[PDB]
Design a protein around this nucleic acid. Structure first.
Ligand SMILES: [Mg+2]
Ligand SMILES: [Mg+2]
Ligand SMILES: [Mg+2]
Lengths: 64, 95, 243, 197, 95, 87, 132
RNA sequence: ACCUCGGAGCAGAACCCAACCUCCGAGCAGUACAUGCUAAGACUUCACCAGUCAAAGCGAACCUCAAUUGAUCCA
RNA sequence: GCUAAACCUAGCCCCAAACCCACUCCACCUUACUACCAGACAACCUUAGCCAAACCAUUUACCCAAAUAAAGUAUAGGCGAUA
């Protein structure tokens, strides 16, 4: 009788409870939702990661 | 108190959330310095009669320079405010 | 891993848990008010909604304050609602040119002023805007009492406010010896700004000296176990004599 | 498509047809977020048309108007703003909020002549001129004008909503509740004055 | 060009093609011929109108524009009295 | 094995602790209580009168609407004026 | 707080506004084919090796399909039973139109036919006069 | 020394063809002021950009030369 | 046949939940881990730049307070990249 959805049943992190995405999107979602609670060094590594991934996906590769 | 405004337009934000900033927004321009603006003589009521200004119970507009210099520190005049102008006008009526 | 709470909540959680937890509620409310200051360095939009000249369509607008710099001497001496503006600008008001690191600092003035309640003549570095707004307020003490704290932004002014409210709440003859008439006249003129004595004491203080005063209040030598046991034993012996 | 829906029997022509019933029959999906102010009638399907319905619309072509009036139906336009159209096309999500029925507003600076013309069958236009326009359309497209005053359901055909009213039954300021089904009015002088203004 | 955004992780359009071109839902693109407002006095009138008139685009640059633009600009729109409804859709085509 | 009990929505409203920081502010907001009322009926215990706008809210609303959204009289007046100018 | 008053009598309009969740059985029109060229299925159904069911909206499960921009076909979706008889029947039916026998593709798993070229209206009329 | 455009040969006969290969030139001028609007169909300087020809119709009377030149944004 | 080879544990990474630490025997700011004397010594300042734009000079996302959506829309922009 459609009281719940199968996405809210899974047990896992908070930045992904019924969601999929590449590593860039995952990291930016993680900082959007959890970056305030995150440790300093881990947040710095995450920022560096999103920066490298921006550079890679948008500047580097074939098909342009 | 110089007045400035931002060269770039800030991205609009919610009423509960404060905006994102950037040096693109740190950049400024000057619009007005409000010191070159022409002065405005302030109104004051003088108690003791003085030369060319007025007499007891009289109100008059005068220069900020002179007023802040010699009237107020000496205690001669006071601000043209409703706490006292009614007293001045009623004593004038008595006179 | 992660924290239970964010970082920007840590300071307020500390405010709630610790020595400061014993502080009254009004002081905490005052320090956590976070009320917007009066804009001095920009023209605020008269309306929240505005129509741009490009297209005939509505466009919501929200003013954005300027990150003013308040040096220590500004807090030592009442400047007003202004401070150093640190920023940068384009040369020859041309976007398509060189950017330059700019600093504006207002024109200060060392002037004398007197107050009837403190009965003392103070020397302070003030500004034309300060003079104009106190003239609008029809006296210094009026502005010092009616100042929204974020607009005054001067611990000197806040200390003046503290002392003045304390004196108004106490109604002390300390101020006017041999002039009860003048005393009562001034207190009646400034009657409406009055607030309780404890409020006047707590107001105008940062959390550091707040917790310091709280410690000075709470601190006291511990009553001896010997004394409290003598009391309990006298109670017990009274109960036994009763029974 | 209208004939298709009515002869499939999803929308009841006996009941006054309107945008809510259309969206419930899925005759047209609406995307107010994509700034679609409503639905328009078109010339296509004039033939094989026996609706007789009292359709409510925003836009209307003269061919559709003439066909519906020939078959005896009723056509009249009704401007809805984006938010009003949202509440109309999805009422239940709005009623899950609990805030009262909003008030419609007049058209913008441009469409007032459109919705006030009588040839247009604008809800703001005069009724006295609607017979005239019906007569010109009949005289144009060569079909007698059937007087719908005789049929038993002329009342149904002339059922209409005044501006600043979303639904035929409800009005602004009203609050609806479905869990423990109830309806609520303020009965405060200022509030009702506003919701009537 | 910006295959993934920094804030949302989505493609992002260049407003250049939006200002220069138009898309028809069939998948076609039109454009105003270049040099249509420059140096009209020396150009012969036939050239002047060849420049004034709209034209279409090659499939290559058509799909290039499609690649840089997003689906919002490729959707079906129902405007009022917009002259391009005659041409959004295609008729009597094979192969 | 008996299967775990079926997961189900929490019955009744969800009234969080306002003196609890990690709880967002949009729950403490009034619209939250309005949603709970409209969903779970009057069983929520929420006062119905609170959802309507205060007289101050109504005042600001009528002010802004009078300022921005004109009336039909002024509308047709401006139309006539501009049409006469064009003529 | 502001006052209010309750009512329940005006709930019929809300009941009207409540949307539906199942397709309604269409009404019994006194004469067919009703406008828009709709025609309900004959009863009793025809005794044949196969049978074609209608859709949720009580339409025929013929559709069209385009691929590569040029491959231009029509499909029958939900044939139940011996789909080979049906594909042979449509081949014999369409052979005079083209002068050649199609090379249609049958997926008896899903019960689908796939035929080059658009013949939607013709096949619809055919299935109607057959009474599916 | 040159960097763009046109004509001739190499490239003899549909098209195209390079070299710091050989020659001549251009970066205008002159006459009208329908040197107006629209429009089928075609050529195309090896892509695109650009650049060309033009039937018919409305409206009217009774362009030469070979290149003779410069996109977008912006003002 | 030597040199060698093989092992499976120590423990570790990501999440979730929950907020967290302080010999109180002596010693530790002078030259730290050093039992004992006259000083007036105190913090509050825009991040920049690489890189990208196939050079580079304006410009180039880097969070700060509900997940999705509106929306990569309105807008900004050597109206370019891009935001
Ligand atoms: Mg397909
Ligand atoms: Mg070519
Ligand atoms: Mg001719």
């Amino acid at each position: 009788n459609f009281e719940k959805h199968p996405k809210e049943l899974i047990r896992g992190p908070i930045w992904l409870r019924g969601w999929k995405g590449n590593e860039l999107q995952r990291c930016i979602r993680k900082r959007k939702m959890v970056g305030s609670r995150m440790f300093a060094d881990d947040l710095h590594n995450l920022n560096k990661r999103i920066r490298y991934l921006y550079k890679h996906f948008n500047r580097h590769g074939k098909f342009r | 108190t110089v007045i400035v405004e931002r060269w770039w337009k800030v991205p609009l934000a919610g009423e509960g959330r404060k905006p994102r900033l950037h040096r693109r927004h740190r950049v400024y321009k000057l619009v007005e310095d409000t010191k070159h603006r022409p002065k405005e003589n302030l109104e004051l009521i003088l108690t003791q009669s003085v030369e060319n200004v007025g007499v007891r119970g009289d109100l008059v507009s005068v220069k900020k320079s002179l007023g802040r210099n010699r009237l107020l520190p000496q205690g001669l005049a006071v601000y043209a405010s409703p706490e006292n102008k009614k007293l001045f006008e009623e004593e004038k009526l008595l006179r | 891993p992660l924290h239970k709470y964010p970082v920007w909540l840590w300071k307020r959680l500390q405010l709630r848990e610790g020595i400061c937890s014993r502080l009254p509620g009004h002081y905490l409310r005052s320090l956590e008010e976070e009320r917007t200051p009066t804009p001095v360095h920009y023209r605020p939009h008269g309306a929240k909604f505005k129509i741009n000249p490009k297209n005939g369509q509505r466009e919501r607008v929200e003013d954005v304050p300027i990150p003013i710099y308040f040096p220590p001497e500004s807090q030592r001496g009442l400047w007003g609602g202004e401070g150093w503006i640190l920023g940068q600008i384009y040369a020859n008001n041309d976007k398509l040119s060189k950017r330059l690191k700019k600093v504006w600092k207002p024109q200060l003035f060392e002037r004398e002023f007197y107050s009837e309640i403190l009965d003392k003549k103070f020397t302070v570095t003030v500004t034309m805007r300060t003079l104009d707004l106190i003239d609008e307020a029809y006296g210094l003490d009026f502005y010092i009492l009616k100042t929204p704290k974020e607009d005054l932004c001067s611990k000197f002014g806040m200390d003046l406010k503290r002392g003045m409210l304390l004196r108004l709440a106490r109604q002390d003859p300390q101020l006017h010896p041999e002039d009860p008439e003048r005393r009562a006249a001034i207190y009646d003129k400034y009657k409406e700004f009055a607030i309780p004595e404890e409020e006047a004491e707590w107001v105008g203080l940062t959390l550091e000296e707040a917790i310091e005063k709280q410690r000075l209040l709470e601190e006291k030598d511990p009553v001896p176990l010997f004394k409290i046991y003598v009391a309990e034993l006298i109670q017990q012996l009274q109960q036994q004599a009763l029974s | 498509r209208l004939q298709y829906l009515i002869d499939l029997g999803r929308v009841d022509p006996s009941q006054p047809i309107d945008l809510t019933q259309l969206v419930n029959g899925r005759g047209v999906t609406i995307q107010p977020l994509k700034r679609d102010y409503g639905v328009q009638l078109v010339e296509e399907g004039a033939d094989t048309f026996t609706a007789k319905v009292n359709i409510e619309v925003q836009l209307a072509s003269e061919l559709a108007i003439a066909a519906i009036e020939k078959n005896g139906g009723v056509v009249t336009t009704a401007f809805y703003d984006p938010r009003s159209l949202d509440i109309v096309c999805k009422p239940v999500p709005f009623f899950l909020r609990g805030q009262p029925i909003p008030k419609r507003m007049l058209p913008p600076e441009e469409l007032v002549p459109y919705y006030t013309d009588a040839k247009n069958r604008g809800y703001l236009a005069d009724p006295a001129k609607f017979p005239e326009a019906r007569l010109e359309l009949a005289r144009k497209y060569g079909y007698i004008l059937p007087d719908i005053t005789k049929d038993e359901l002329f009342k149904m055909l002339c059922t209409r909503k005044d501006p600043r009213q979303i639904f035929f039954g409800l009005a602004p300021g009203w609050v609806v509740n479905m869990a423990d089904k109830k309806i609520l009015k303020p009965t405060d002088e200022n509030l009702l004055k506003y919701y009537t203004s | 060009l910006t295959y993934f955004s920094a804030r949302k992780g989505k493609r992002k359009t260049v407003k250049a093609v939006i200002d220069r071109f138009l898309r028809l839902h069939c998948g076609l693109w039109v454009r105003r011929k270049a040099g249509y407002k420059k140096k009209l006095w020396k150009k012969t009138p036939a050239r002047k109108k060849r420049l004034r008139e709209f034209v279409f685009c090659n499939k290559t640059q058509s799909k290039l524009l499609d690649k840089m633009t997003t689906s919002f600009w490729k959707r079906r729109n129902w405007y009022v009295d917009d002259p391009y409804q005659k041409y959004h859709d295609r008729t009597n085509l094979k192969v | 094995y008996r299967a775990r009990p079926p997961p189900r929505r929490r019955p009744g409203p969800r009234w969080p602790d306002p003196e609890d920081l990690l709880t967002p502010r949009w729950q403490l907001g009034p619209r939250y209580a309005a949603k709970q009322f409209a969903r779970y009926g009057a069983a929520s215990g929420v006062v119905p009168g609170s959802l309507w706008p205060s007289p101050e809210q109504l005042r600001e609303l009528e002010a802004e609407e009078r300022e921005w959204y004109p009336s039909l009289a002024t509308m047709q007046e401006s139309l006539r004026v501009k049409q006469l100018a064009e003529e | 707080y502001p006052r209010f008053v309750e009512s329940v009598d005006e709930y019929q309009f809300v009941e009207r506004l409540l949307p539906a969740t199942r397709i309604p059985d269409p009404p019994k029109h006194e004469h067919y084919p009703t406008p828009s060229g709709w025609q309900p299925p004959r009863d009793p159904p025809p005794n044949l090796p196969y049978f074609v069911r209608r859709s949720r909206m009580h339409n025929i499960p013929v559709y069209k399909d385009i691929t590569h921009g040029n491959r231009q076909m029509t499909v029958i979706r939900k044939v139940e039973g011996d789909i080979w008889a049906l594909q042979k029947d449509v081949e014999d039916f369409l052979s005079p139109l083209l002068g050649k026998t199609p090379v249609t593709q049958v997926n008896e798993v899903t019960g689908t036919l796939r035929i080059k070229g658009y013949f939607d209206q013709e096949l619809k009329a055919w299935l109607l006069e057959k009474g599916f």
